[PDB]
Amino acid sequence: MERASLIQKAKLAEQAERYEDMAAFMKGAVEKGEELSCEERNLLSVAYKNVVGGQRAAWRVLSSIEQKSNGPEVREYREKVETELQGVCDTVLGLLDSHLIKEAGDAESRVFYLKMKGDYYRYLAEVATGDDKKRIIDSARSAYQEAMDISKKEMPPTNPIRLGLALNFSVFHYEIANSPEEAISLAKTTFDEAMADLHTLSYKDSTLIMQLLRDNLTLWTAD
Amino acid sequence: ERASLIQKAKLAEQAERYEDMAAFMKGAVEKGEELSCEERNLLSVAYKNVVGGQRAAWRVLSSIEQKSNESEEKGPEVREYREKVETELQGVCDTVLGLLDSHLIKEAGDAESRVFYLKMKGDYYRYLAEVATGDDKKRIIDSARSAYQEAMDISKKEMPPTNPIRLGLALNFSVFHYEIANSPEEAISLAKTTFDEAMADLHTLSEDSYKDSTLIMQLLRDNLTLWTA
């Protein structure tokens, strides 16, 4: 297909909740070498976000049913799923590295993709062992921090993508870097700063995200 | 080791990996040894899900594509993707129908299993019908009907009217009558008849039996109500 038939099919796949098909088309569209529009950028994220999501919950369940045990079929199936999963993260990371991350000028685009690279290194960190864990945590952090730097420098505290970044970086703090106080701090600040500037917005976008921030706040700053 | 396959199928269930689960179960069954009651369900559940979500995709695309009746026309894209999903669904169904023919359907032994697998054959033809152009469609609808009818005959003779398998069969068969076969009277008659004969025998069922029978009965009466309004 040409670059436009992939992109509407991906949109059809989305409607159909055929999320791996969606990812397949989105990967193909990106490999036609041309910059992604803003909504196309969101199709790519949604595609892989959903594929990996199912793999992560599968892995989470299989790991639960393993740490107790305390036969081999469990470890094996966990390993099959880990491998599929990493397979998928490596594929997004390769796609980010080779076509997306900086054939860019926009503060938004550079931040979107870096947020994504933070995200998919983070998924890999959850599954990692212990140097190539330390190593991918480091990478995720670097990806997120650099997106954080740019977005502070160049975007408003209500920008939906900047909020998504803070949201996720604060989840990384809490869940990956065992840094609860950094996570609660980052979530609080981000909420408060976005709240302060809400009146200026055409914004259910920012608002939706603000809620997930608070939700996390509630869960974390709590017994 | 089928022991391993069955094990990973149960693992795949918990983790909601239904392709996998259905693959483990396709394996197990291909070892040639019969399938216990629980393993019957793992097979059923595994494929129920792969198909069901494939059905859902197809319905979404069939709807988009079926209008497209002229804000249009991103036409080529839509039709081809529906057809891709189609062949894919059709392959799963055939795989299930294959398993049934090439291993699972038998003369033997147990009556609950024979009815179960012939009920499954009918369900999976039925899924194929929902998607079919025909005749070839009047053709697959027949095959659904024949399978269901072979299960019906067996359960009527070899099972009591309250049986959860016999009831689920009657239930599905009656839905197939109304939804697919354009035989709403057959559907109603069968659903009422099934429900009443269960009801009249419910009294002879021990404490630890009826919650299952009665739950399907509630689904039979529901449909009856809906098919009268």
Curated annotation (Swiss-Prot), chain A:
Which residues carry the site feature described as Interaction with phosphoserine on interacting protein?
R56, R122
Superkingdom field: Eukaryota
Localization annotation: Cytoplasm; Nucleus; Secreted
Q: Which GO terms describe its biological process?
A: cAMP/PKA signal transduction; establishment of skin barrier; intrinsic apoptotic signaling pathway in response to DNA damage; keratinization; keratinocyte development; keratinocyte proliferation; negative regulation of innate immune response; negative regulation of keratinocyte proliferation
Spell out the post-translational modification annotation for this entry: Ubiquitinated. Ubiquitination by RFFL induces proteasomal degradation and indirectly regulates p53/TP53 activation.
Gene3D superfamilies from the UniProt entry: 14-3-3 domain (1.20.190.20)
| PROSITE patterns xrefs | 1433_1, 1433_2
CDD domains in the record: 14-3-3_sigma
The residues forming a coiled coil are none
The PTM Phosphoserine maps to: S5
In alphabetical order, the GO MF annotations are:
cadherin binding; identical protein binding; phosphoserine residue binding; protein kinase binding; protein kinase C inhibitor activity; protein sequestering activity
Function of the protein: Adapter protein implicated in the regulation of a large spectrum of both general and specialized signaling pathways. Binds to a large number of partners, usually by recognition of a phosphoserine or phosphothreonine motif. Binding generally results in the modulation of the activity of the binding partner. Promotes cytosolic retention of GBP1 GTPase by binding to phosphorylated GBP1, thereby inhibiting the innate immune response. Also acts as a TP53/p53-regulated inhibitor of G2/M progression.
Q: Which family does it belong to?
A: Belongs to the 14-3-3 family.
Q: How does it assemble?
A: Homodimer. Interacts with KRT17 and SAMSN1. Found in a complex with XPO7, EIF4A1, ARHGAP1, VPS26A, VPS29 and VPS35. Interacts with GAB2. Interacts with SRPK2. Interacts with COPS6. Interacts with COP1; this interaction leads to proteasomal degradation. Interacts with the 'Thr-369' phosphorylated form of DAPK2. Interacts with PI4KB. Interacts with SLITRK1. Interacts with LRRK2; this interaction is dependent on LRRK2 phosphorylation.
Report what the protein is called.
14-3-3 protein sigma
Q: Which organism is it from?
A: Homo sapiens (Human)
This protein's gene is called SFN
